[PDB]
Design a protein around this ligand. Sequence first.
Ligand code: SF4
Lengths: 318, 156, 70, 175, 82, 96, 105, 114, 122, 98
Amino acid sequence: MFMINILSLIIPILLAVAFLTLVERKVLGYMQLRKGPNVVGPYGLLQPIADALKLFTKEPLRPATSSISMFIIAPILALSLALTMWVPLPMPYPLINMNLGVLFMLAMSSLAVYSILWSGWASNSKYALIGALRAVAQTISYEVTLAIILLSVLLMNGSYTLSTLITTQEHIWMIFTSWPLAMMWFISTLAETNRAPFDLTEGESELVSGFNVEYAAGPFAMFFMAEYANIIMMNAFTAILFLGASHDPHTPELYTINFVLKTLALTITFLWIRASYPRFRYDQLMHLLWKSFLPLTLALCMWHISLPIMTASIPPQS
Amino acid sequence: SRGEYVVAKLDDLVNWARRSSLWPMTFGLACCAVEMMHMAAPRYDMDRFGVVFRASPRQSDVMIVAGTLTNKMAPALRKVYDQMPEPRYVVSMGSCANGGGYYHYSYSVVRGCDRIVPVDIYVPGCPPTAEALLYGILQLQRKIKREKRLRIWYRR
Amino acid sequence: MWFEILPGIAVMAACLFIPGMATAHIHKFTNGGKEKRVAHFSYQWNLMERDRCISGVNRYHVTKGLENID
Amino acid sequence: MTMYIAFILSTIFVIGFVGFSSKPSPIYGGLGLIVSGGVGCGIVLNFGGSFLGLMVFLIYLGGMLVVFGYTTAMATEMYPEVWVSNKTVFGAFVSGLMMEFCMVYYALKEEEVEIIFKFNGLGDWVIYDTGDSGFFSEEAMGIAALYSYGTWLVIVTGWSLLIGVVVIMEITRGN
Amino acid sequence: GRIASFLKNAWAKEPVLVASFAIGGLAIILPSLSPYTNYAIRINRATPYNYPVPLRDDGNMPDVPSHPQDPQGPSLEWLKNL
Amino acid sequence: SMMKWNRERRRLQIEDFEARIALMPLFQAEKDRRVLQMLRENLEEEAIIMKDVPDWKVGESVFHTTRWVTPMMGELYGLRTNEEILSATYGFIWYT
Amino acid sequence: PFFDVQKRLGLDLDRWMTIQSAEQPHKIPGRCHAFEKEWIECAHGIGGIRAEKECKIEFDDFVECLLRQKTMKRLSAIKRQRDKLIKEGKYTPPPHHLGKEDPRP
Amino acid sequence: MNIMLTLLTNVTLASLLVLIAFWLPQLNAYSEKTSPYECGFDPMGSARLPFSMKFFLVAITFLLFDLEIALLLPLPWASQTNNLKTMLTMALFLLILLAASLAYEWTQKGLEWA
Amino acid sequence: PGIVELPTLEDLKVQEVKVSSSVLKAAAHHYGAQCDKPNKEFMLCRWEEKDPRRCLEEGKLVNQCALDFFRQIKRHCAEPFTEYWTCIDYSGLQLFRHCRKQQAKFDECVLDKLGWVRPDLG
Amino acid sequence: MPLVYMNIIMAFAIALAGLLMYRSHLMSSLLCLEGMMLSLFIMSTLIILNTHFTLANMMPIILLVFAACEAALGLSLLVMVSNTYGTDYVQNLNLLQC
Ligand code: SF4
């Protein structure tokens, strides 16, 4: 029955990604004095399905200069890793309960970056190469600060087990304890998911399509699905880490509802930011993270190391 | 025949997917592009109909030739059309694109984009009003709705 | 108006809700109406193996209480 | 087949090494290094080293990122080489795979192979210990003793890293 | 006096660095002067990670208890009150 | 609030560790008896298995020392079924 | 040129990790603590030249605990004999080894 | 094994999607359609020529800082020791050395580009 | 070298405490309070001797004492203990926190019928 | 020794042979150095975990730290070589002879 559980996690997540596309289109339109898609289906509900069918019934083109093996492998890696990262999340009970789930998610996010770089390099197009290099710069900018913030926050948890975050935040949200780290973490999640104002890899205005400029039909659909799934998964991680939820062991549905609502709110915030702010220059993104976020993260990491000791609040290891 | 019914229904599904999700490429040559942007503007928002502007030719389904096509720009237009994956549809907007319009007798103007690329729907006007362009796009959607690829496959 | 956005959000919310509920109820079904035991350290896995031996059906969730004694 | 997950992963590790060692273009050698790092993580996790394995994967994932960027900048070539683009690279790849297959079958079939040391074909499960670690992760407790026991190692490593930043700055000054 | 000028210039021009340095300095200093750090050490010691091996009784160990719930031996009342 | 909650968590962890301490001696007795029984069964079946083989002492120690050495996984589960071997060797690692 | 500054100044810069039998966090024992302790105690103050032969039994026991080469060889021989007997048809694994009896808790 | 099964399932789903994308659609591949994309005109040189990295120093420093990320991750378990004084001193020593390295590179115009 | 002197199967046969982990954890504190003596004797034997064979009899005594403890529980406080260990079983981590009320019932019943007092923290 | 030790030592041998047999690029040989470091990490971790040498489970992490230090040094040298010659090719390190 574990296979049933894996399918239950996978299939609904992909449908959630599909309808997230509709939600984004409508939210941005309404924030722009427009109505998002409404013609296709009641209130635009069937637009995602039409988009998926159109993309998968569209000719996929293999670039003449492309390296076919990497060109094909990259979307597979992106989608599979995007689906994999959802596994360890406690909602409330995780599909795979790992002692070090947080480090697993960090490593898997690191692995997903190669999908963008491999896609851009294999495309053998100048714009794709520029997008891949931008992705490299983005990872260089954000990875260290992301890891340090996660370590600082998890010091109060006492472990890297995602499930134990629920117990730690039983009485209060961790955002109250670590609201600055929460802000830097939210921006870093925006950077990791390559979302505005850090949508540099794709950068339609500056790079025609970035790394996916040479991708069409199914592979592009896979890249889009990976992107949106990563958005949802990272926002869910933020909800678990900071905006904890009440869990009644006899009724998990309450925790599941609270968690889903918080993640929806965070994803809506993502779309809101994409609508509101302009895009950063990748030099500016790297400067922001290294010159502004990194020193504050180091100072706050020192603070969070000291605070449990000086306040006798060291969390239980188990 | 049951096979004919299955083919007809699958063709209906494919045509509905293709017409509902029509992604024009970000290609605007001349003044007609401005009316295209006004079509993208809130009043006649084309996103409601599923028409979303996508820059990359490989991620686009429709090319709208808005503006005069000079002899200098024609090879680039043909290249962009060729690099666009199929099914691909071309809409010619404005008199300049349709047949050369005001600059028909110029040395530097292609007297119609039909000479360079096949055109499916011609939207008259100079500039065509945004409502006219939306009407043309919906006409292209109906044309897609009338397509019978799978039925012809079964009958062939 | 803005309420028109809500239906897609509701569909997305239901899709997201399905995974956690499915995981919890599948764990309940597989583990005999009780939460799947968490073994983050070797001691708990040893307890689970001992329960597997005690049960007699090679299922750890089956719990033998005072009745088995004497 | 699940009785020998470790052996399969180690063979994949050796194949990745034969991939990045035949020296294709740095991109595909980086692919090999990434695959080998993942497989090594798998092996260490199978032996009980979850933190160590995940740390290797994370560090090599970041390291190969800078390698990929550097390649596209310095180690670049107009026609980058794959393991089937040159007789030398394919020769090295085939020789490495054959040498593995040779030792693999030799040790699996023969009870005790001895290439340079003596190796026993019995599955890795045999060596594992029967003790219990209780409410503890021995790897985690040992790795955490770097701050309580290994003050000297912390001093040396921190100084090495600061001097490494200085060294990179000086080596790249370029006068 | 000039130190105040430097601090004002820092807060105007580089607030993030001022905040970071202040937080780091507090992290360094405050734990030394905190009463509760010894409480943290005692809590970590009190945690019974490994079994309390009994010791053979030679008849000359008054302080060592002969059985839990006996008045002799360590007490954890401080942590309960904490 | 986090200080209060974490101190309570440490106290509850102490409670759980004390429960484990109370239960450990019985577990140690069970484990020793089980290991000895498995070793005896292995010894007897080996006596059956290699009676014919020349110059093979049965149950001979590979250590010079006449001291108890904790048996390795192979000794206890060497001749048991594959499912038992997989469980003993990789269960805690694989369990998730 | 091994200037024993650690011994001169009484500083345990690195000797804490030199051996597996030394103090470890939470008194977690090494897999060969007994053998290592016996070998160290045997070869203490007698010099390396003497210890290489007068404590060879201890060192061999330590190596056997570390690598299990002899134990693995014996187990492999037993398994080979059992498989050969099964092929011959003159041996049958007991039901408890086959899983027909509940193992002791 | 559960993690292996999940990874296999996800990879198989992705590969099946790729297969369906490359086999269900109809194709009319011709040279001009599969040529590289350069905004309509043809590319001048290759996309495999060297692409100067103006942030090389930051990348090497990123490697060196990811090492410190690795060294600092055990801290959650370190806080469980009895020698919290030495643990705190060494953790702050490592973090202050990382801060010093960042400050040195910054003041020496190392975090700047080109 | 020498033959390993493994004990016979009959000698290592003992009555077994066939109760699940949740049941043991529910009674863990009172079990340690009541059966401390034999358990401590077995532990001292195990740690001093360093041979599992040498301390078999003390382990048998440990098992017998645990059985007697559970028998007294069954005689006097069966139902409250059954509810208590049922409550602990549901939690995957078998946490004590969620079952405080049933634990209070069990402790009060045990204190009244048998006089046992739960050991305090530490 | 189990066969996994054989495979990991074989990986180290292969990486050493790769490093000692250059072809053109320097990046590939630096990758062979990093591969050797990975193989050493795996061997040390396996030994320390099988022998339950608790206070030695940190040695792999220090080995990785100094491996990354070495990698940084290698890349910082490769950048200068590329700047002075335009490529990372080893054949350009030919000014010093004998
Ligand atoms: S048709 Fe008229 S509006 Fe359109 S580009 Fe030509 S002149 Fe401008």
